[PDB]
Amino acid sequence: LSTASVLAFERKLDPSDALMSAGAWAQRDASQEWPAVTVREKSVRGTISNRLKTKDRDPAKLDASIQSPNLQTVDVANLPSDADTLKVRFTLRVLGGAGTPSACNDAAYRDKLLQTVATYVNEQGFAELARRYAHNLANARFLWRNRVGAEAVEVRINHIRQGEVARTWRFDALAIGLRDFKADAELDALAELIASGLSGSGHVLLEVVAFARIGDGQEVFPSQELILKKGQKSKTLYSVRDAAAIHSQKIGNALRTIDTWYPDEDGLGPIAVEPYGSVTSQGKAYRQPKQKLDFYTLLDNWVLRDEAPAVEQQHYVIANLIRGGVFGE
Amino acid sequence: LSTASVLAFERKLDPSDALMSAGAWAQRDASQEWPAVTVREKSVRGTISNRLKTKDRDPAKLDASIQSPNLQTVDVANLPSDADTLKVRFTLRVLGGAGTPSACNDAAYRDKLLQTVATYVNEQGFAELARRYAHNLANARFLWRNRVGAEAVEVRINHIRQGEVARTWRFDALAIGLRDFKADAELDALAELIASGLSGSGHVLLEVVAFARIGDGQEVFPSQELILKSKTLYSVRDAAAIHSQKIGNALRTIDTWYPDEDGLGPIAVEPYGSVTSQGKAYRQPKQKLDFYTLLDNWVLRDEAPAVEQQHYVIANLIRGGVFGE
Amino acid sequence: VTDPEALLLLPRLSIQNANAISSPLTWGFPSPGAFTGFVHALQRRVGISLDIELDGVGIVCHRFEAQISQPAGKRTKVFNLTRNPLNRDGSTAAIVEEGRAHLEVSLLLGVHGDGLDDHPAQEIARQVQEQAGAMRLAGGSILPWCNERFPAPNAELLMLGGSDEQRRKNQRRLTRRLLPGFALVSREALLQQHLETLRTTLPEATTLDALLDLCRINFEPWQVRDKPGWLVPIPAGYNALSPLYLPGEVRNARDRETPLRFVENLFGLGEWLSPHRVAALSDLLWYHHAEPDKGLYRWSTPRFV
Amino acid sequence: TISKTDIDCYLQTYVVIDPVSNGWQWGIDENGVGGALHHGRVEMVEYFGLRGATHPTEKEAMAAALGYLWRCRQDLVAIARNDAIEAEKYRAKA
Amino acid sequence: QELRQFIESFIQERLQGKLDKLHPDEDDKRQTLLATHRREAWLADAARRVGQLQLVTHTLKPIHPDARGSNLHSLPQAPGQPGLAGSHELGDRLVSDVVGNAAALDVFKFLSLQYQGKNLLNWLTEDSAEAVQALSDNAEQAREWRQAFIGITAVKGAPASHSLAKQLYFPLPGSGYHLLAPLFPTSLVHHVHALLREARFGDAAKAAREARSRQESWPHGFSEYPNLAIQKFGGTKPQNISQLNSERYGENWLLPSLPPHWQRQDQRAPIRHSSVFEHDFGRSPEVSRLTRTLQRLLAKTRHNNFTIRRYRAQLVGQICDEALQYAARLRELEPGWSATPGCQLHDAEQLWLDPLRAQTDETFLQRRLRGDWPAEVGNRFANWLNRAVSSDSQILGSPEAAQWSQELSKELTMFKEILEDER
DNA sequence: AGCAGCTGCACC
């Protein structure tokens, strides 16, 4: 009747830290002994390229600043001179129990919410969302900056059931682009596996490897840390067990960018699934609450006022419930 | 319409760390198994060649200029005694997407910037910038102190299409000067390939090798490390190398349009275009010809500068960096 | 508390982003109350269908890597954070400080109930291991362990299943399977001994724990004074401030069928021993103790000394 | 007005002075605790041992350690100066 | 009424700074600063301004700062069960935290104006001459302002935890749960941080560190507090969270609960050196501070033997503990590191360190590793551990060396007993 | 011509 004062949803489609190794192409068959790339602190000499704030100063000091070099120490990680292939490996744990909340004040809100999610999974199964997630794993969207100049990316996904593999998939990640959502047989099979895993019967284990032919001795990019003036490291790179790696949240945002239904020129591309759907690279928060298409108003319009959005906005609401969140008034 | 607080631009034209080996001339073709030039730590015994301080000019402590062998230890890289040719090898990737930022806080400024860069590429394509990058490849400016006395320098550029060669260029770095941008057919073909990579019609990864004929036993110069001994040369896997930022600075020396007396030579592309080794910064912000004033006049106020200034602005966008409030 | 009829060894558990902040004052290893709550939750999920009551858990901590950075120019350390999305119009949110740490800890917990007689001899351990994987341990997901070289099986050993030398042989064979790590035990009596010898007409406030936590190089006519072992302050349960409220009384509650109490932390000592100087692996097991009318919602290892 | 002894108050804890069979060897401690058992880690020079001369008197080895700290390892001196500024800012407070 | 001059000082020292921090050149805006922020309409608005609560050990703002629950003022009941402590249920009394709106904190700054103590002014229940100093025009509005200042500093509203605070179940003995919503104890985190600031930046530590820089004696000693961590609650302005969060800006100053081996990652195999006890065991990072402290302890007085013999025994127990853990963690490198042709064979110690090598070379090693019974590897360890003694005739002539050999032989017998059942 | 929501704003 009234809204639940607390509401929470645990995260499904669990990613992991993706370890990165180096090795040559056409050796992807026995690609299990590859040495991992390490982070290295190198010191650089550059110029003063930032724009100046001419307040309470003199032109002589800032002019002698821009004539003087800038001494920094950064952290980089590059492939060796006999290795042009970056191998990015991670584990995906698709849990199950999609629409079941993890916190609720009222019994009435929980009853009505499980009723509406039940009518959703009856009348439209996890078929668009699973195809969208399997396409986001099909292209190397998790290899964020290592894909902008790669000649070819080969993605192998193995389904590990009890102690070993049972099904292998081998995708070419550039044919399946970053904007189109088509229907293939092996992609529909992978979407069927993710659909069977999201419904509570089991928690399925996928292992994903990605071979990217970047260039001989070129630069690869792990993720940078958020640390909030001489001898200080400006750029710190992520490396777990002395091996360079990307965060789990970066991979989650990468394989979560499937939202192609947003009311301000949705043909630019799929964006991240979020309440007040925001792309931090663009700075613009689509699905504005001034418009009637945010997650909160659509959810409590579905479960409290018995109205219903279209087929697309409820797919967005169910995908936000799959992602997780902490809401409540 | 105002300038974004965060504006980030990714580097196009990414080179690799250039590795050094040694061998003989007339074996340039089968130069695959050439032994790598190794940095050796040596100790030298010198004198006091610095000017004396206000404290070291005393009468009883004037012995520093008299009795001081000064006992230093440095790093040194030389050629083997039966080899007169130094080989420097690196890979150069050119990406494309020159005017699209990687981070922004205002999307109206982003659409204005994309419209401005598309207006540029529609009117003035990547014909001058790719020609200047190809001329900085065709002469071995990547060999910084390794070119200054060499009897014969030859560069060789291969196109890595799938895993192997698609096109071979074999340029003489001593016929092509270091201060003028002339014309040639193969240089124009390399400029067309670099422009095709920079515009986005293909993937360009080149293999650039360079032979400098120094002579037997001579001193070759790799990059010197910055330490935040007093001389530490750079080496990856026990082989002397040049840094990728020095190689990228060698191909960024395309700026023959600046507010100074530009009859001297090309400089590197920087905002407030600075040669800190010469101590003078051209394109000072007092004269309205640095990158920020032209970018805030072209995007915000629709005041287009001259075509050479547009070339310099697009080159500064290719270099990338942190622009914003 | 009660004595176990069997001990269940979960092998080397890998946790990706655990809560390195375990208190308002102590950082590092997570609270052991998180581990006891994990075993209680695993009893709620899988302990009921097998008829096993699961209490008491050991903590062996094979390795620990905290996502911290020392700033250049300061002695102390700060945390590597993650980035949050925009609020409503496009603006960077207020950053919340959450410490993260990669952990590898294996568990030994106490099977106590009447669900194993002779028939499900090893299936109980496998089912608890398959239910423990799709859970969390300190706020972080347990790693799936995809195929690298060889797996790590579960174990179930009955302390009553054999004679005295069978008890010692099975304990020696089990304690080698958790050997690269360090067990965490609770030492309340030692801290009370230190408070007894320290309080010589000078009152204490909290110095009995921060004095064992520091390193002093004080002089007795340098020298650095030493202790046996590694004595760390750990959060040993909660304490009550609020007189307890009805289930449907406090607004913005987590549920309205469980009484709420506003609580504060507690701080005690812990030692990181070896797996082979405890004389019984039926110890190291972390239990609850409520005494709900007073507060003092505590957790500790009993029957140790 | 921070003298060298005010920085030397907080720089001293990165050294350790071990009496050996011939004299007073010294070494550098990374954690800044005096080279203790549980919390600290003292770096050993490569034979393995402390990076110090065998001074007869303890004042000589302490001065050699602290002069080598001031001469070579400037980041430790920076940490000691960052502590020494607040050491008198705390007196300026109370 | 001697409070009145101290009162009219503070409003002037506020309004001067409000005029100065404006950069004024136009618009004639300062007149309202002369009108309101000089007279006692400031006092009427200070009576109007609320949000402040005068807490002690209960804040909900350090846990997700956009969460408005209930904040309390109660010291927890003194526990009789010994072994732990969670609050300042002892000396070094509280610091009276206050949570509220950041614009309203000038009212608390006026309350804490230390005219002969701020305890009898913030909780101004016992004032007699201050009343007519609050209003030197009447006696009605003076009592009204006194009640408005001292009454709002103890008020609750309703218990809440605004869906972003923590509340975690606790299993009861029989059956049932309690909800257990915790709070951040800012007075206790103030007091611990103040002790940690007094032990380092104080006068006594500055005095007793100068004596150590000079190798002296002095009345006392000092401490260090290693491996602290900073957790900064306020992002850029800490006034939103607490006044105590502004006095200790960010600066949680947490204490380490780490494992012993946390910053000790190293992966190496002793393929080069023959004997592994003399080399790469002393070169291990943790064993060196055990062995050097054992050399420090094996030359001392034997008068108070009951504690020093216990410490000397436990320091050898830790050494054999690390000795077993070395072989335990060397089984993660490879199943075999001795099958390759090497300059040093060193099979006597590598049969202990390569157990899965017998799984590979199942022909001769399967008979030889179970037929030879390697149990003299502890004797090689004892010859290395004998160099942890000092070469002094005074300790060698007495009978305490026989006691040292007794405890070392007992612990090495336990070591050999564990090493016997390694097959 | 009177309400509830939203947004800009003031202050520390």
Q: List bases in chain F with any atom under 7 Å of a protein Cβ.
A: 6-7, 10-12
By CB atoms closer than 10 A (0-12, 13-18, 19+), residue D46 is exposed
Domain positions in chain A are 1-10+98-125+258-329, 11-97+126-257
D40/E75 Cα distance (integer angstroms): 37
CA–CA distance from B292 to each of B288, B296, B300, E201, E287 (Å)? 9, 6, 11, 47, 59
Inter-residue contact C22 to C106 (CB < 8 Å)? no
Given resolution (angstroms): 3.4
D12 part of contact set with chain C, CB < 8 Å: no
Inter-residue contact B163 to A84 (CB < 8 Å)? no
- Name the nearest CA neighbour of E205 among C194, D75, D84: D84
Q: Do E221 and C218 touch (CB under 8 A)?
A: yes
Angle, vertex CA B126, rays to CA B123 and CA B127, nearest 5: 95
Write phi, then psi, for E102 (nearest 5 degrees).
-75, -25
Inter-residue contact C292 to E77 (CB < 8 Å)? no
Give the orientation angle of helix B307-319 with respect to helix B128-138, to 10 degrees: 60
- Name the nearest CA neighbour of A149 among A87, A215, A78: A215
Question: Which nucleotide's C1' is closest to E105 (Cα)?
Answer: F12
Give the orientation angle of helix C123-132 with respect to helix C32-42, to 10 degrees: 120
B234, HSE (Cβ side, Cα atoms, 13 Å): 21
Element (H, E) at A45: strand A40-46
SS3 call for B118:
helix
Q: Which residues of B touch A46 (CB under 8 A)?
A: 245
CA–CA distance from C70 to each of A266, C73, C76 (Å)? 44, 9, 6
E119/E96 Cα distance (integer angstroms): 9
The token pair at A113 is 């919410």
B and E make contact (3+ CB pairs below 8 Å): no
- Compare all CA atoms of chain A with the CA of E232 and give the residue at the minimum distance: A228
Chain CA centroid to CA A57, Å:
45
Write phi, then psi, for B318 (nearest 5 degrees).
-70, -40
Q: Residue for token digits 């000017």?
A: B51
Start-to-end CA span in chain D (Å): 19
Write phi, then psi, for E149 (nearest 5 degrees).
-85, -45
Residue A157 neighbours by CB under 8 Å, 6+ apart: A137, A168, A169, A171, A190, A206, A207, A208
Q: Which residues of D touch C73 (CB under 8 A)?
A: 75, 78-79, 82
Q: Residue for token digits 């009108």?
A: E35
- Compare all CA atoms of chain D with the CA of C72 and give the residue at the minimum distance: D75
Write phi, then psi, for A280 (nearest 5 degrees).
-70, -20
Element (H, E) at E367: helix E365-371
Mutation pick from C74, C136, C141 vs chain A, by most beta carbons of A within 10 Å, is C141
- Name the nearest CA neighbour of A158 among A70, A89, A238: A89
Polymer length in residues for chain D? 94
Q: Do C147 and A276 touch (CB under 8 A)?
A: no
Interatomic separation, CA of residue E416 and C1' of nucleotide F3, rounded (Å): 87
Q: Do B91 and A25 touch (CB under 8 A)?
A: no
C58/C35 Cα distance (integer angstroms): 9
Interatomic separation, CA of residue B103 and C1' of nucleotide F10, rounded (Å): 32
SS3 call for C46:
helix
A273/A279 Cα distance (integer angstroms): 9
Q: Which residues of E touch C244 (CB under 8 A)?
A: 178
B113/B295 Cα distance (integer angstroms): 9
Inter-residue contact B315 to B269 (CB < 8 Å)? yes
Q: Do C213 and E225 touch (CB under 8 A)?
A: yes
Helices H, strands E: what count in chain B? 7, 14
C163/E211 Cα distance (integer angstroms): 62
How many angstroms separate the CA of residue C118 from the nearest CA in chain E?
28
The token pair at B304 is 């287009």
CA–CA distance from B83 to each of B147, E107, E417 (Å)? 17, 84, 65
Inter-residue contact C4 to C159 (CB < 8 Å)? yes
Start-to-end CA span in chain E (Å): 91
Determine the protein residue whose CA lies at the shortest distance from the C1' of F11: E103
Q: Do E178 and C292 touch (CB under 8 A)?
A: yes
Residue E346 neighbours by CB under 8 Å, 6+ apart: E270, E273, E274, E275, E276, E338
Write phi, then psi, for A315 (nearest 5 degrees).
-65, -40
Which residues of chain A from 239 to 268 reach within 8 Å of chain E, CB to CB? 241-242
Write phi, then psi, for C60 (nearest 5 degrees).
-115, -25
Determine the protein residue whose CA lies at the shortest distance from the C1' of F5: A290
Task: Write out the DSSP string of A30-62.
Answer: TTTSPPBP--EEEEEEE---SPP--SSS-HHHH
The token pair at D72 is 């070579």
A179/A190 Cα distance (integer angstroms): 19
Q: Do C264 and E57 touch (CB under 8 A)?
A: yes
Torsion, Cα of A150, A152, A156, A157 (10° steps) = 60
At residue B171, what is the residue type?
F
The token pair at E257 is 């609960």
CA–CA distance from E337 to each of C68, C80, D90, E274, E345 (Å)? 34, 38, 57, 13, 11
Interatomic separation, CA of residue A288 and C1' of nucleotide F2, rounded (Å): 29
Q: Please say whether the dihedral angle defined by the alpha carbons of residues E224, E228, E234 and E236, taken in this order, is positive or negative.
A: positive
- Compare all CA atoms of chain A with the CA of E264 and give the residue at the minimum distance: A241
